[PDB]
Amino acid sequence: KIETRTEPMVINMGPHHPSMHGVLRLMVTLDGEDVIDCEPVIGYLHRGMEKIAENRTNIMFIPYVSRWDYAAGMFNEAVTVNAPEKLAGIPVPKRASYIRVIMLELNRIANHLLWLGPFLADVGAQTPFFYIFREREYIYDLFEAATGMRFINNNYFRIGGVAADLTYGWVTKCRDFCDYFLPKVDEYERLITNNPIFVRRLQGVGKISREEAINWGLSGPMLRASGVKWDLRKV
């Protein structure tokens, strides 16, 4: 049965894992409350995209790519069309590059809204978990207007540019959204910086130094959260 011993207890987080960031399995071992080791078991969603790609042409593989970072979507299509277009030296026009910056920045917001919703419910208050869905559903329809489906499988990026131009009432509809969303960004900051029960869960909890972030190899808002100032849109 289930005995009661004195050695440290290993709990399996399980590949089930009812959370929105996929199927992870951690064999974290406990010391009453403190953890002493943890191994992440990954590869529950290893479908083999590096082996498919060796049997796909680029227009066959552009539908495949927006499934790695399926929170983001067109961030995967960004690199994929960039890899033969910066190798063949194919010029992208300035309008197609400006729509790519428009599409990637709306994807970064939708990537961040998909991170924030679970994270706020993980750290406490789960009433904003249902109101950041609605904020992402506006970006879902800016992608459904211009591109196809919803947030992924949106074949927008091409080698010579972008798949099609924007729709008619589109630029006036970010300006309805991106001017409505920006008041709500500061609402999310004053959710955690105020109410200082949340700051005692997030100060010093998972602290990684600057010197160990470059050594372990990090990027984006986890590297830059250690005071590294390394952004590849600027670098």
Partner: protein, 359 residues
């Protein structure tokens, strides 16, 4: 082995009337009238759970079943009776079945206390605001046999965590009743609502015990509600807590019996601190949360049913305030749960008992 013949000696001697008087179930009409009002007290609290929680999220709630979700507590409770409840493979059998029974038969037997309505009182016992806190302490045992007999590691961890939570919040709940048992000069729940029936609203105990209502309110919701509860294992301290291996009709006791516990908590906030079956002047205007006339046939049928059910109507307000607190406070961790019922709610429940005195 002299007691082997003993338990079958008075068995058949009692069985001659235990089958003969078995058909006459709820032969008093005010016992059957209570159990219907007991059932629809819970069936509101499942409908009011899914509808208030949808209103704070700007979704609808259950439509498409009943008129507007009125049958959604019923189908959620009837599917669990129809599901083929199969035990886990390597587990206990007798301790697994009585797991949910020890949790919820306390909150069913101690429903006999609450005197909802001036003309619906089942029994005025010599106590009952003390018999309620005594019976509700059997519930940590059922969280230990639900955790033990389910025979997985994560529900023992959830069973020891659910029991040590109910341990922590029963002792400030005991002193919050001790404040209104000191003011009322007794434990009789008819005598408690009689001290508040003198001036209607200005003689309620929440006006006299502003802290002790708050000690009762945080301690009640830390033993029935969903807000300070780690049975959702969003912190992944367990798999799903002690209610993990429970499916079908045994989970229905864990599911619907946590709404009996919510209503019974709310039925005693509206007895102790708010006047049970107490309300202001009936012949009021159209803006009195009523119709438009002064003597309607719909208003002679209200106060006849409000005369039998007013404490539960008041308990329907604190059921509503318990859901409105779910989407307000953060889902606090267990290290700060037990640092509240011991380090905060236990001194301020003891200070209030001395301030209910002269000191």
């Amino acid at each position: 082995x002299x007691x082997x013949x003993x338990x079958x000696x008075x068995x058949x001697x009692x069985x001659x009337x235990x089958x003969x008087x078995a058909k006459l179930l709820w032969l008093p009409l005010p016992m059957l009238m209570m159990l219907i009002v007991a059932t629809v007290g819970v069936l509101v609290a499942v409908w009011l759970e899914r509808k208030i929680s949808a209103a704070v999220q700007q979704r609808i709630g259950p439509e498409y079943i009943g008129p507007l979700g009125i049958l959604a507590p019923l189908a959620d409770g009837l599917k669990l009776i129809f599901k083929e409840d199969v035990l886990p493979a390597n587990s206990d059998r007798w301790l697994f079945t009585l797991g949910p029974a020890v949790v919820v038969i306390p909150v069913f037997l101690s429903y006999i206390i609450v005197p909802f309505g001036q003309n619906l009182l089942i029994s005025n016992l010599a106590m009952g605001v003390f018999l309620w806190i005594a019976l509700s302490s059997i519930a940590p045992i059922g969280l230990l046999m639900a955790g033990y007999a389910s025979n997985n590691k994560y529900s023992l961890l959830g069973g020891l965590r659910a029991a040590a939570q109910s341990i922590s919040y029963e002792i400030p709940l005991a002193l919050a009743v001790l404040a209104v048992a000191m003011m009322s000069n007794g434990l009789g729940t008819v005598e408690i609502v009689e001290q508040q029936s003198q001036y209607g609203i200005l003689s309620w105990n929440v006006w006299r015990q502003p802290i002790g209502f708050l000690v009762f309110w945080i301690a009640a919701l830390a033993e029935c509600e969903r807000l300070p509860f780690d049975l959702p294992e969003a912190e992944e301290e367990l798999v799903a807590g002690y209610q993990t291996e429970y499916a079908g009709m045994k989970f229905a006791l864990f599911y619907l019996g946590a709404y009996v516990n919510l209503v019974l908590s709310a039925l005693l906030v509206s007895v102790l601190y708010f006047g049970g079956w107490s309300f202001p002047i009936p012949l009021e205007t159209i803006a009195n949360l009523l119709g438009v006339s002064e003597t309607n046939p719909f208003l002679q049928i209200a106060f006849a049913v409000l005369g039998i059910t007013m404490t539960l109507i008041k308990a329907y307000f604190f059921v509503f305030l318990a859901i409105l607190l779910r989407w307000t406070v953060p889902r606090v961790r267990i290290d700060q749960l037990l640092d509240l019922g011991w380090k905060f709610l236990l001194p301020v429940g003891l200070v209030n008992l001395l301030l209910t005195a002269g000191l």
